[PDB]
Design an enzyme around this catalytic site. Structure first.
Site, short mmCIF file in Angstrom:
data_model
loop_
_atom_site.label_atom_id
_atom_site.label_comp_id
_atom_site.label_asym_id
_atom_site.label_seq_id
_atom_site.Cartn_x
_atom_site.Cartn_y
_atom_site.Cartn_z
N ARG A 97 3.33 19.58 51.78
CA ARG A 97 4.65 20.25 51.73
C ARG A 97 5.64 19.62 50.73
NH1 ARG A 97 6.21 18.37 58.01
NH2 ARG A 97 5.13 16.34 57.76
N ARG B 295 14.48 17.76 52.02
CA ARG B 295 13.11 17.74 52.48
C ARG B 295 12.40 18.95 51.97
NH1 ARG B 295 12.31 19.30 58.79
NH2 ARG B 295 14.50 19.41 59.45
N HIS B 296 11.07 18.85 51.98
CA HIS B 296 10.17 19.91 51.56
C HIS B 296 10.68 21.28 52.05
CE1 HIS B 296 9.24 20.39 55.73
NE2 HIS B 296 9.37 19.08 55.80
N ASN C 167 6.65 24.22 60.55
CA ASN C 167 8.09 24.35 60.80
C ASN C 167 8.34 25.73 61.37
OD1 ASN C 167 9.18 22.61 57.79
ND2 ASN C 167 8.89 21.83 59.87
N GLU D 68 6.00 11.52 56.50
CA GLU D 68 6.76 11.67 57.74
C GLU D 68 6.31 10.71 58.86
OE1 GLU D 68 9.43 12.00 58.97
OE2 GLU D 68 9.84 14.02 59.65
N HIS E 20 10.93 14.05 54.20
CA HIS E 20 10.80 14.61 55.54
C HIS E 20 12.03 14.32 56.38
CE1 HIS E 20 6.65 15.34 54.44
NE2 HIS E 20 6.61 14.10 53.97
#
Lengths: 190, 190
Positions: free
Chosen positions: B57, B7-8, B14, B77, B142
């Protein structure tokens, strides 16, 4: 009599999406403490015992009451140990093994150097003993602690325990009875 | 053929413990975008396709690879609906009943005006069939999306699905084989 369970008002760490620690109340965390005092006043109670943990976030919220309070170490929040003050993303990244294991047995799992709900339930035995032989008591504690106390009074299994609804800024008014316990949930919007 | 899932790099949300949103890579999130480009180059992959979602992202992390990539809306996502950008404490406080119903059945559950994992699996169906008729593909996506792809390749059930391990900064190299799928997890420490 009634037992009022709620936790400290929103902390800096709650705000930052991080667990444990020993941070103080946020701006609205403090506004909750004042709203809590007004609620306790509106209850028309003549005598009330107030318990707090040793953590600043509980003490500070109690300060807003204006009445004396006792500090119990046994009311301190669960110790996430190595994972203290981390976010879930952070723990999932640096401790993927642990996190997964914690998800498979939430009641017994301990993070490295931490405590389990089971441990917490054990150190809370004397707090429950006292509660059971007292009159009106207000416990300003923490989410994990509050879950353990609530499971006891509401006769919940150790499986339901870690998932028991324990939001911030909500007072649970419990009135023990002959076998069960009445429950009333008061949301202090601030 | 190999399917790389990651994922990013860590987003701004986050870092704050907030879900959903469309924030960008954080400082070390970019450092992961870079380390991923290093890992990818040293893998010496023949004609590697790189898929990305339509979110910042994700595109931002692919941008550091040097090579071109394509964007699929289907890889965006899971939408938390009204709980978008909220911390878990916030959703537990403002949406206590909802939060509880979720833990009950995480696969079928939808937040107010949000999507469920079941909904996600649906929109990912065309991604899986394309992924199937391909050679080497790096899919930068995601957490919820990764769980759905991973569940398919690793032959996991809908129950295990919402709890599949999907850390940040970790590449999951899947190699479809006759008996199923071999897996290699590479943590990119930055």
């Amino acid at each position: 009599r009634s037992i009022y369970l709620c936790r400290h008002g929103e902390s800096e760490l709650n705000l930052r999406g991080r667990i444990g620690g020993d941070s103080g109340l946020s701006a609205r965390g403090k506004q909750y403490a004042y709203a809590l005092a007004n609620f306790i006043r509106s209850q028309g109670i003549s005598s009330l015992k107030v318990w707090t943990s040793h953590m600043k976030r509980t003490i500070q919220t109690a300060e807003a009451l204006g009445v004396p309070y006792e500090q119990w170490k046994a009311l301190n929040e669960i110790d996430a140990g190595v994972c203290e003050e981390m976010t879930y993303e952070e723990i999932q990244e640096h401790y993927p093994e642990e996190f997964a294991l914690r998800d498979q047995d939430k009641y017994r799992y301990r993070y490295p150097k931490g405590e389990s709900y089971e441990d917490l339930v054990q150190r809370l035995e004397p707090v429950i003993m006292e509660l059971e032989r007292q009159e009106n008591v207000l416990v300003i504690c923490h989410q994990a602690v509050m879950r353990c106390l609530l499971a006891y009074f509401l006769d919940k299994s150790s499986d339901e325990l870690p998932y028991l609804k324990c939001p911030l800024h909500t007072v649970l008014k419990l009135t023990p009875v002959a076998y069960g316990c009445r429950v009333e949930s008061i949301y202090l919007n601030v």
